[PDB]
Design an enzyme around this catalytic site. Structure first.
Site, PDB file in Angstrom:
ATOM      1  N   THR A   1       0.730  -1.185   0.000  1.00  0.00           N
ATOM      2  CA  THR A   1       0.000   0.000   0.000  1.00  0.00           C
ATOM      3  C   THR A   1       0.834   1.355   0.000  1.00  0.00           C
ATOM      4  O   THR A   1       2.045   1.406   0.263  1.00  0.00           O
ATOM      5  CB  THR A   1      -1.001  -0.043   1.194  1.00  0.00           C
ATOM      6  OG1 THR A   1      -2.017   0.918   0.925  1.00  0.00           O
ATOM      7  CG2 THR A   1      -0.403   0.233   2.524  1.00  0.00           C
TER       8      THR A   1
ATOM      9  N   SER B   1      -4.480  -3.146   1.156  1.00  0.00           N
ATOM     10  CA  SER B   1      -5.059  -1.824   1.170  1.00  0.00           C
ATOM     11  C   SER B   1      -5.117  -1.091  -0.224  1.00  0.00           C
ATOM     12  O   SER B   1      -5.744  -1.607  -1.160  1.00  0.00           O
ATOM     13  CB  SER B   1      -4.320  -1.096   2.312  1.00  0.00           C
ATOM     14  OG  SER B   1      -4.922   0.083   2.599  1.00  0.00           O
ATOM     15  N   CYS B   2      -4.458   0.091  -0.411  1.00  0.00           N
ATOM     16  CA  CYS B   2      -4.420   0.779  -1.719  1.00  0.00           C
ATOM     17  C   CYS B   2      -3.788  -0.014  -2.826  1.00  0.00           C
ATOM     18  O   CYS B   2      -3.986   0.282  -3.992  1.00  0.00           O
ATOM     19  CB  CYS B   2      -3.747   2.141  -1.624  1.00  0.00           C
ATOM     20  SG  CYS B   2      -4.597   3.184  -0.412  1.00  0.00           S
TER      21      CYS B   2
ATOM     22  N   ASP C   1     -10.464  -4.980  11.422  1.00  0.00           N
ATOM     23  CA  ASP C   1      -9.607  -3.926  10.831  1.00  0.00           C
ATOM     24  C   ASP C   1     -10.101  -2.572  11.361  1.00  0.00           C
ATOM     25  O   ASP C   1     -11.278  -2.228  11.186  1.00  0.00           O
ATOM     26  CB  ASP C   1      -9.775  -3.980   9.348  1.00  0.00           C
ATOM     27  CG  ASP C   1      -8.868  -3.083   8.647  1.00  0.00           C
ATOM     28  OD1 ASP C   1      -8.612  -1.914   9.127  1.00  0.00           O
ATOM     29  OD2 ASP C   1      -8.527  -3.516   7.496  1.00  0.00           O
TER      30      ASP C   1
ATOM     31  N   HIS D   1      -5.559  -4.556  10.376  1.00  0.00           N
ATOM     32  CA  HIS D   1      -5.352  -4.177   9.003  1.00  0.00           C
ATOM     33  C   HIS D   1      -4.162  -4.795   8.267  1.00  0.00           C
ATOM     34  O   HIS D   1      -4.248  -4.929   7.015  1.00  0.00           O
ATOM     35  CB  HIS D   1      -5.265  -2.618   8.942  1.00  0.00           C
ATOM     36  CG  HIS D   1      -5.340  -2.070   7.572  1.00  0.00           C
ATOM     37  ND1 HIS D   1      -6.436  -2.229   6.751  1.00  0.00           N
ATOM     38  CD2 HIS D   1      -4.434  -1.351   6.859  1.00  0.00           C
ATOM     39  CE1 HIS D   1      -6.209  -1.612   5.601  1.00  0.00           C
ATOM     40  NE2 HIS D   1      -5.014  -1.058   5.660  1.00  0.00           N
ATOM     41  N   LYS D   2      -3.049  -5.114   8.972  1.00  0.00           N
ATOM     42  CA  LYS D   2      -1.918  -5.691   8.388  1.00  0.00           C
ATOM     43  C   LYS D   2      -1.885  -7.212   8.616  1.00  0.00           C
ATOM     44  O   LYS D   2      -1.077  -7.752   9.424  1.00  0.00           O
ATOM     45  CB  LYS D   2      -0.656  -5.007   8.966  1.00  0.00           C
ATOM     46  CG  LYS D   2      -0.611  -3.464   8.692  1.00  0.00           C
ATOM     47  CD  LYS D   2      -0.456  -3.215   7.229  1.00  0.00           C
ATOM     48  CE  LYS D   2       0.143  -1.837   6.968  1.00  0.00           C
ATOM     49  NZ  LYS D   2       0.038  -1.556   5.520  1.00  0.00           N
TER      50      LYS D   2
END
Lengths: 260, 259
Positions: free
Chosen positions: A10, A79-80, A206, A234-235
């Site tokens: 990300t 993520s992104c 998350d 999240h990770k």
């Protein structure tokens, strides 16, 4: 049996975020490539010299470009990173056996490529100690961001052991979503990104992509398979590295090309 | 007793190397600083833009200058970080409660600042898949190096968890010893560097600074204290993080002033 995984970080991160997943996947016999995107990790460019999402994604697209004829890869984006995966898929759909989204932005073909970014920006509006800046390309102002330490600790690396967080303090850099560039680019196409298989991996813990947003993305653009991982954050490649690897194994067992 | 440790990475590495040791020290109440030197880690400069050892060391000298009056630090330097420690000590001896050399180059005051680099380069002349290059600055020729993956796995990270080797491959960059610049510099001073307390930590299983080279360094400029760690490898802050932390807690108790 085995696959070639291309892991894609990300914004504000680098190849380094995959330090524990990569060797885990190598143990099973897989090939793994983890790339620095432009102005990310130890790439020498700063973000202020990157004008478009396309430039930002260039190291992925030139890697895809160079893949020998007939070879295929499973893209994995956190993520992104999801955005990058869609761009890559739109140019090189024949080179992709599947794409896995892990707590990731998962664009569609029906709306503007910015669509899920715009929706995310509305449901997570508190960036805490994140610092925002701008710079210019010839005709556009781009927003940059340097993730705040408290945002990272509390919302990104929530159940990661402290050394991962330390590492992130040492290594994260100024990044950009390139939101406005995303809002004005051609939609992703049904024949490119819309033709690849899509797997969506997430946890409901998350603290950055909350469950109604992730549920929203799943519904908006129904993937081929969904895997929900219990706990973590999240990770997931840090907090639930083994489980993630076990899911990636099954994705390779499904989608990787068989050898003669 | 707590301390303020300032952790100094080697050439081709960056602050990241300390990612397990920093939080471990902090749990005991210590303050820790870990810096990126010039053109290292995520510093935005490339090594080909840096002309001298001094320039390379600048972020450590800057941080020492910035230290509020009365405050002291224990400097900790791995491998070529020991050369930065000596340069810092020579400029700010009075800010240094001790300097800890962790399988590190430990210069002296009687010979040229290059002396232990020159020796090291004779003791370890095979760098395997490491890539060497030169660049130009001013009127000097400078050698750059990009550590080979095989050299890193076999000689540096040999008993490190596989993920630390993986980080290294993802993060190591082109660096330089600046040997030529060190050979022409003025010697470190007995009054500055020669006045500080030096602690030497090492293992005889290090595969790049072998034991006869470490013993040569200790014989050449006798430290105030030596700790020998059993096993491990050149990267003790990754391979033996906890025993290093325990040594550093003892260094703190010995050296770090009572308020």
């Amino acid at each position: 049996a085995t696959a070639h995984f291309v892991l894609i970080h990300t914004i504000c991160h680098g190849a380094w975020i995959w330090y524990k997943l990569k060797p885990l996947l190598e143990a099973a016999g897989h090939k793994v490539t983890a790339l620095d995107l432009a102005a990310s990790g130890i790439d020498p460019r700063q973000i202020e010299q990157i004008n478009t999402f396309d430039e930002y994604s260039e190291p992925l697209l030139t890697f895809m470009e160079s893949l020998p004829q007939g070879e295929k890869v499973i893209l994995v984006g956190e993520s992104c990173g999801g955005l990058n995966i869609a761009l890559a898929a739109d140019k090189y759909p024949e080179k992709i056996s599947a794409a896995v989204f892990h707590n990731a932005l998962m664009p569609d073909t029906e709306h503007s490529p910015s669509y899920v970014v715009d929706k995310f920006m509305e449901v997570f509006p508190d960036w805490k100690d994140t610092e925002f800046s701008t710079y210019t390309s010839n005709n556009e102002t781009i927003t940059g961001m340097k993730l705040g330490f408290k945002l990272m600790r509390e919302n990104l690396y929530t159940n990661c052991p402290i050394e991962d967080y330390e590492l992130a303090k040492m290594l994260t850099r100024k990044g950009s979503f390139f939101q406005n560039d995303l809002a004005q680019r051609p939609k992703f196409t049904e024949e490119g990104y819309g033709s690849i298989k899509r797997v969506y991996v997430w946890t409901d813990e998350d603290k950055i992509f909350p469950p109604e947003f992730q549920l929203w993305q799943i519904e908006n653009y129904k993937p081929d398979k969904v895997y929900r991982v219990q706990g973590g954050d999240h990770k997931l490649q840090l907090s639930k590295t083994n489980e993630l690897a076990e899911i990636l194994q099954e994705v390779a067992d499904t989608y990787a090309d068989l050898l003669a």
